[PDB]
Amino acid sequence: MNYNNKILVSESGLSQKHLIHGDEELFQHELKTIFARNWLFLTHDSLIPAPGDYVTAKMGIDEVIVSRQNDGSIRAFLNVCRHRGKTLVSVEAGNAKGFVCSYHGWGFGSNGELQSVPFEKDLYGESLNKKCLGLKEVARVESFHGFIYGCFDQEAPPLMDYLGDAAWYLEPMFKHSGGLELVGPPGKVVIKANWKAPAENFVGDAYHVGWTHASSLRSGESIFSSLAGNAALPPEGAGLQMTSKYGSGMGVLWDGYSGVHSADLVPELMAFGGAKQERLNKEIGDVRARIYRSHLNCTVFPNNSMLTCSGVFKVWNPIDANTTEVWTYAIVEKDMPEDLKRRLADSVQRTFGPAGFWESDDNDNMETASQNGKKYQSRDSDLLSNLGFGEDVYGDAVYPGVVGKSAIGETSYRGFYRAYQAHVSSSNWAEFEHASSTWHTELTKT
Amino acid sequence: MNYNNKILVSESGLSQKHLIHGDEELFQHELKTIFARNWLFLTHDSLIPAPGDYVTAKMGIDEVIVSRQNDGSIRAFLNVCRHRGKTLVSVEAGNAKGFVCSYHGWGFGSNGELQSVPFEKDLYGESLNKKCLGLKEVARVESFHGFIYGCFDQEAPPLMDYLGDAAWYLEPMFKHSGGLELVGPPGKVVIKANWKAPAENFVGDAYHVGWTHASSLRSGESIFSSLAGNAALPPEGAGLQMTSKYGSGMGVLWDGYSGVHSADLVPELMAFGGAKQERLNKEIGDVRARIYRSHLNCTVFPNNSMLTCSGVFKVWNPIDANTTEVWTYAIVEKDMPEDLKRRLADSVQRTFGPAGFWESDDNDNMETASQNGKKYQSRDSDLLSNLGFGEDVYGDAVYPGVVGKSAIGETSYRGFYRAYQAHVSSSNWAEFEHASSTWHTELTKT
Amino acid sequence: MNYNNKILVSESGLSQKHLIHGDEELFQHELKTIFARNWLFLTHDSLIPAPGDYVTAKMGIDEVIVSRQNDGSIRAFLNVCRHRGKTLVSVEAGNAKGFVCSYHGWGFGSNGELQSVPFEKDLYGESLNKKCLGLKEVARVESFHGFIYGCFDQEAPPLMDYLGDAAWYLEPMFKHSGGLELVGPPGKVVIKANWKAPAENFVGDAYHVGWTHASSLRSGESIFSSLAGNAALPPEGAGLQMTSKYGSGMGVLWDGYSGVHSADLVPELMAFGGAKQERLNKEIGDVRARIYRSHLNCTVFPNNSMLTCSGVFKVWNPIDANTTEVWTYAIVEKDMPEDLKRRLADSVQRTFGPAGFWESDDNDNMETASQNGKKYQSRDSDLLSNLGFGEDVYGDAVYPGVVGKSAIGETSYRGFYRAYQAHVSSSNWAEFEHASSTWHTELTKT
Amino acid sequence: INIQEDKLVSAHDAEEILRFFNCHDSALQQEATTLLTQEAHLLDIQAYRAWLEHCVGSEVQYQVISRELRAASERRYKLNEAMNVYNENFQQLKVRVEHQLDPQNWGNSPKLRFTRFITNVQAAMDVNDKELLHIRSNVILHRARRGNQVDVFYAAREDKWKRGEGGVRKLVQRFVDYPERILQTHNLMVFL
Amino acid sequence: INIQEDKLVSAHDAEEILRFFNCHDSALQQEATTLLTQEAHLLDIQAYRAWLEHCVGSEVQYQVISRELRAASERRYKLNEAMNVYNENFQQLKVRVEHQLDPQNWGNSPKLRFTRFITNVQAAMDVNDKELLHIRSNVILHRARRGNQVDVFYAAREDKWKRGEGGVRKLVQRFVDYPERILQTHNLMVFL
Amino acid sequence: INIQEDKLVSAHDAEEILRFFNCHDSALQQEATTLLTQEAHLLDIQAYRAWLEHCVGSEVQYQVISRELRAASERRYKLNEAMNVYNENFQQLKVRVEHQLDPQNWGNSPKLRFTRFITNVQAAMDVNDKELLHIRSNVILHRARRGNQVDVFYAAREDKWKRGEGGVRKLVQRFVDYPERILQTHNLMVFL
Numbered sequence A, B, C: 001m002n003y004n005n006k007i008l009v010s011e012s013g014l015s016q017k018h019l020i021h022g023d024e025e026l027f028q029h030e031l032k033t034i035f036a037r038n039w040l041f042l043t044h045d046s047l048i049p050a051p052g053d054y055v056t057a058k059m060g061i062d063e064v065i066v067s068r069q070n071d072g073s074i075r076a077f078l079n080v081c082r083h084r085g086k087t088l089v090s091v092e093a094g095n096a097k098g099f100v101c102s103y104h105g106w107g108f109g110s111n112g113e114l115q116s117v118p119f120e121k122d123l124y125g126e127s128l129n130k131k132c133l134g135l136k137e138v139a140r141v142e143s144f145h146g147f148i149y150g151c152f153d154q155e156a157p158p159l160m161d162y163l164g165d166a167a168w169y170l171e172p173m174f175k176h177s178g179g180l181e182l183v184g185p186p187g188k189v190v191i192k193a194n195w196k197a198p199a200e201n202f203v204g205d206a207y208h209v210g211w212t213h214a215s216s217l218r219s220g221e222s223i224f225s226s227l228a229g230n231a232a233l234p235p236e237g238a239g240l241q242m243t244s245k246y247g248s249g250m251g252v253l254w255d256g257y258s259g260v261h262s263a264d265l266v267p268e269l270m271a272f273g274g275a276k277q278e279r280l281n282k283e284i285g286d287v288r289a290r291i292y293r294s295h296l297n298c299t300v301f302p303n304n305s306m307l308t309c310s311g312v313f314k315v316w317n318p319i320d321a322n323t324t325e326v327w328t329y330a331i332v333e334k335d336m337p338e339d340l341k342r343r344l345a346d347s348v349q350r351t352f353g354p355a356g357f358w359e360s361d362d363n364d365n366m367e368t369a370s371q372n373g374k375k376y377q378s379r380d381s382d383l384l385s386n387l388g389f390g391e392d393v394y395g396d397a398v399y400p401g402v403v404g405k406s407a408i409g410e411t412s413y414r415g416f417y418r419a420y421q422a423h424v425s426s427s428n429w430a431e432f433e434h435a436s437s438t439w440h441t442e443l444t445k446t
Numbered sequence D, E, F: 001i002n003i004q005e006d007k008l009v010s011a012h013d014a015e016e017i018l019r020f021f022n023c024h025d026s027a028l029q030q031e032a033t034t035l036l037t038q039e040a041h042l043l044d045i046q047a048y049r050a051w052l053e054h055c056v057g058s059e060v061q062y063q064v065i066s067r068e069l070r071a072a073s074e075r076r077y078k079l080n081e082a083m084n085v086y087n088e089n090f091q092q093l094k095v096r097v098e099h100q101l102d103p104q105n106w107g108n109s110p111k112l113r114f115t116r117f118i119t120n121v122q123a124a125m126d127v128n129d130k131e132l133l134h135i136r137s138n139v140i141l142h143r144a145r146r147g148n149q150v151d152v153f154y155a156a157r158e159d160k161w162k163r164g165e166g167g168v169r170k171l172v173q174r175f176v177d178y179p180e181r182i183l184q185t186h187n188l189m190v191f192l
């Protein structure tokens, strides 16, 4: 397949070829043009707060060690020995000043440097150039209010610019709330779906909620529960959708601070969020204080998703075109009482974790939509994302980005896939930029 | 591999490259040139007799919904939602006026039409062109005496013409007997063989029976039992072999109406078949009435096989070059007493079903012959099908098609693989026809 | 990938691209340029001593039957029926005058000839040319002191020449000891590593022993036990490393006759080896008699390895780029007392067999080093084998081959990978020879 | 069990439950465990004739079904719900046993290896036939052959056992509703 | 057990061992086996309401954890060692049961098939609460759905059971430390 | 069993059958179940020293074989039929235990997870050594490590147990004929 020419996503992001969820050659191509190029979620400050603390993380199919340095910074390195390629670290988290390879005993620092080689003097003499044998380092590591992302491509925009118009929506919760903590360890489960299936769902899919999650809505008594079985449509003005230049997007459901949490947490959460909102009005204004306590379903392009207020935080780690390893953490506000944080974390896993009953509703949808992309008669078929097309705006006086002023639509699908196509058909960041110089105009056509 | 030029099957179908049972690139090519082009078995009238009745079926690697329409016709559609590609139907059979997608709740009729979209007015307004969003329909659906076949290629010959000379042999049992019913549900088992291994075996392999099935012959006491361990050769005139332009073929074993059934059914069956034959003599003549009660081992090209009289009905559903999902039904004559039909159905599964002891004899043969086609030193080796070559005839005054007037030979292999090669090297039906204008001459050489 | 041009192994064998352990296209290419071209281990005289005795063996991914002929020679044939490709032999060893196919009953002799075809006269008449239907024969089968190797390529050097300078080191144990026996049956286990990972480890990796095997060294009390946890370095003059033109190589650890065997065998073995060495001094000289009772870790290129004195004998049978089937036999000296042979065989399996505690230490090292070769950021990375480079010699007055006069180094890695690269980039033996005309000069540079 | 409330429970499953929840007889559960362990031992060592002679009653029905996947809400479509993978009388079991023992059963060389794990044994005497013993048990059956073929079967067995020749309790009915619709074990050629 | 000598043994595991090695009560082991077999039967036939009513105490904690992989030698890194796949009180179990029974739970059509194998049952009365029964058992849980989806779960269960309404022994605590860190079963949506 | 009639049965298997079919002692079967459950518990929590001290006799032979695949009709080829995956005396088991516990056994970090399922327990006293207890049982052994490595082992165990120090019954022989010829579990580094 010629990725320069092949139209995998049609103009304005209106449709995508179904093969994108199934084609292994394209998956391999995504390793280069999506995962090696873009910002990927690694960890949070709260999980590696002290010098020497480390975790392992996936970046695409690669594994990295992410380590807190003595100077307070974070550096990340390929989890691969520079001698004969053995995996250095076999655990998920810990604290150490370095990592020793179990094959021939080479010792690397937390800073990636080759610090020791057994019997170096007797074996190598002065001939081993250890300065050139440090672990292969992730070129870019940056923080968004404690959330640590990495990028293998030195040419990438800074993380903040990459978030584009999405940052404005995230800041009330990520910054102005006083800050979030990530509660680990994550749940980890393999699903037989393409990574794009859950990514697209979290970025922009409110339409599915009442139907897909009918049983969880009816059974859990959460605040979006009026939707069960499409019994009722969220009223006019219940929310909006947004998307951005580099592909990140989200839905906003106004005021939905208790999110998917069952009635056992609703009064407590609605009290807490409302109290903080009242304080925030004076600081960031009424609209942004309201956004703080509004439910955001967001994907940070390509494969990091979240539900704010619900507190669900996801990494869709790619394995192959029909295999994804799902990591699920909880996010909590730092100034919440500890007992509330604990219950919120359990509730995140209860609803969206490995035995999350809500997430279970999505399984067959994501897996079969993905697997159908391999089927002969479906490869060249068109997945539709035209809902709300022709009603999006850009440059609004209040809400930035390409915005659909309605709670349910496919605005964020279009922006996600516009960026995806621009990357797949480009060889580097400069070409992506050239392919994106009229991004908002393309999305707001007709 | 260049499929226009590569000789995968030698002249006259005398040999085939062993790689055809192992090569995944060729399997992918077969999806286009074999499965998307030819007639594939779907279901029987007896399984979907009433309006709204449906089943799911495979056509190659694709899955379709096959539905009885209100007007009495049958239509078939891809089991894939037109919105974002989710699998519509998760059951194997039922009755419904339509199918609702579990993702976003789109509702399709039994006629494939997009009938409803949740909150269409509020979300899409008048902008959704539902008339262009019907399920992707199988272009051709036709019946052979209740047996329903589908073809994705509008250009295919009618099913009756496609059966070619094979139809003459099938009609006494399929038509003149008063009609057959298919007894479901089928057994379903995955074997690690190429679909062509059982297809070739059923189309033309009498040679294997005495040896492969020595233990089942000795143990079951069926009427072909004199063959056990090659203890005896079927006498001269015991049967014949035939093949046809579009690849279908069969063996005929004269008078073998009780087939593989154990002695417990032999007297009853031999009485029933003989009584009907006596009636049929007056209607279709002695030869054709005899064919009615003769055991036919047949493959309807590409991947549907049967043993008439034994009542075994098979679909070899392709998964990959060394994986096939075997569906096994029973066929019974409609005017048989109900108790006999029940016992016949159990006996079909007893002998050739998931725990069929006869079918178990074939496992290692089909699996290893298939898997050896991947092995480096065997890929370019030649599988032989020359038995009886130079003794076949065409245009016989009594028995039509390319015919070998002997019970054991490889006539039907040659016709099967001649058609296979003509399809693999052709881009469409017109090219197949051009490649087949001297089909019988090629098969009767020397 | 263009194998004529791609530098997979750098000059002097100093490094290799990590993708060589992961790339499936290269694995397929190795089937042609490594496994179909080179000498592969089949069996030992001791396992098929009598006429009609046979075993099955893998040669690359192909399976062969290896049979003792009536005239005392050994011939080997593809385990594939010449009719329709079924696997002929389903057992691992036995005695027979021939092999009958379970599909249609064709009978082949122990000499590969098609001897019988059921009902040949009635079915084929005189038309079946059985003389042209013998099993596909392995072109070359040769013995090195009872150890039987096969090669599919008629153009290969004789086995003795292929062993090159390695033969000199093997002869004291393989020949002058009075001869070895192979004790079967082998252990068989699948590991998720590339075949090259254990091959490279056995050919030249003494560096790993103290660290990888720290726990086995500490726990078993064997004679190399001073190495546990890199507590001590083998003193100067403790051993050497060698490599050869066609890729075979080994380490020599002087005097280590009890090898990995636990203290329960040490006194007995050290007595036995020393007594035989004293006799051998007069026959082959002091140096070669010492080599006899010295521990050799050797790979016979490509995928046969051994530890003499320890008595471990390995075949790394390739399945795919990250899958290898490990066969483990014991080697014993024929003139050892039977009770010692029995205990030695159990100890070989105790340490290096399916539950070999030493071999278990290597699992994660080989598997992860192999699997990392598939990871995107590691494919183009360089595995290092530069230890000892610039200190190797050739043409030494005492020790032949390219030799590193030190116990620990990477000399044998360099020779292994030099030959590997020469084969991968060559179309036949003549091209390999042309690519190898300055082999020792390349290895002894700088 | 109220199946109007417990919406996922079949009438048949509810009836079978009631059988065991009532009169618990510990001695009977132990007898049943012995009976089933010995049966599994005979099968595992491929003593099929001994299995017939010692474990299987002359009036046996040995039945394993595969049920077609239908909608939970289905109530119109009425055709045959299941096919019989096995539905054997004694003579039919004997045919299968002879097929296993036949020296020209090529698939049995080299010899197969069977290992059975029987768990969750429950036993209750029939209410009306005081000589009919109901036994329920679950089986994991592991079959290994030809180096690297490994097939694992999982099932619940609803048995009836009755005293026969010499007072030996023998199987008079086994019913298995096989839980996997599409087999991934090459075949179901094992005695569950 | 001396965990200074048996270096691989956790303090918790050593404590749990001690519980069963002491006062062995054969009658108790048999009661426990019955309790667990009946519980597994109810779950297997998807009688979830009956399971709650008959097997689960009002004060239950039903907990399944997934423990982060850490170095055997680790002693500095102190953050949350595990997450809760389940950590349910009675009302939370009821929510999950209603979710299973809801006719718009699309994933439950066609009906799932469950088969549970309970083994290694041990039972011991609590030393201090003479009405608290400790039961340990291992489970293999086989879930089959949609033709060819097959998921097998393996776990050890540390239970406490106590006499409740009508003198019926009911589950008041289940603790499972799930042995596989990354699930390869699509989800853990089964009651272990 | 008549092995001339039951053509697939080995002489050894027939002999082992006879042992259990005769004098059934229910108390013995229960003792054996306890012995094996406790042994499996100690192994599962990796209390290997405790296993040696409490479960393994000083005179033990601990043996697991892998048998070469041969023709069912073979009667000429006479060479070694099997190799020993394990064939350990007490000191050799101790070496393996020390290897497991060594802090430089890199493969044991992060800590492995074991779950054992013991079923089909049979027990019979030796006819001639009234202090020798024959125990047969089957094991499923699940080993999980490093996120996504999962290995499942299946075997039948022929044990002899005898009263040792302090009257504690200990394993004096275990024999396993491993049913899979080519292992698909990376290794057999588990105590069956």
Ligand SMILES: CSc1ccccc1
Residues within 6 Å of the ligand: A201, A202, A203, A205, A206, A209, A224, A260, A295, A297, A307
């Ligand atoms: C995309 S998941 C979700 C859940 C609740 C509300 C909105 C979105």
Ligand SMILES: CSc1ccccc1
Residues within 6 Å of the ligand: B201, B202, B203, B205, B206, B209, B224, B260, B295, B297, B307
């Ligand atoms: C191809 S199967 C078969 C069985 C019986 C008779 C003829 C053919």
Ligand SMILES: CSc1ccccc1
Residues within 6 Å of the ligand: C201, C202, C203, C205, C206, C209, C224, C260, C295, C297, C307
């Ligand atoms: C390559 S394995 C080995 C073991 C012991 C000594 C030397 C090498």
Ligand code: FES
Residues within 6 Å of the ligand: A081, A082, A083, A084, A085, A086, A101, A102, A103, A104, A105, A106
């Ligand atoms: S591979 Fe890491 S030290 Fe050699």
Ligand code: FES
Residues within 6 Å of the ligand: B081, B082, B083, B084, B085, B086, B101, B102, B103, B104, B105, B106
């Ligand atoms: S995928 Fe079917 S309605 Fe959206």
Ligand code: FES
Residues within 6 Å of the ligand: C081, C082, C083, C084, C085, C086, C101, C102, C103, C104, C105, C106
């Ligand atoms: S395949 Fe061997 S005789 Fe036909």
Ligand SMILES: [Fe+3]
Residues within 6 Å of the ligand: A201, A208, A209, A212, A213, A358, A361, A362
């Ligand atoms: Fe959802």
Ligand SMILES: [Fe+3]
Residues within 6 Å of the ligand: B201, B208, B209, B212, B213, B358, B361, B362
């Ligand atoms: Fe057959």
Ligand SMILES: [Fe+3]
Residues within 6 Å of the ligand: C201, C208, C209, C212, C213, C358, C361, C362
């Ligand atoms: Fe090693």
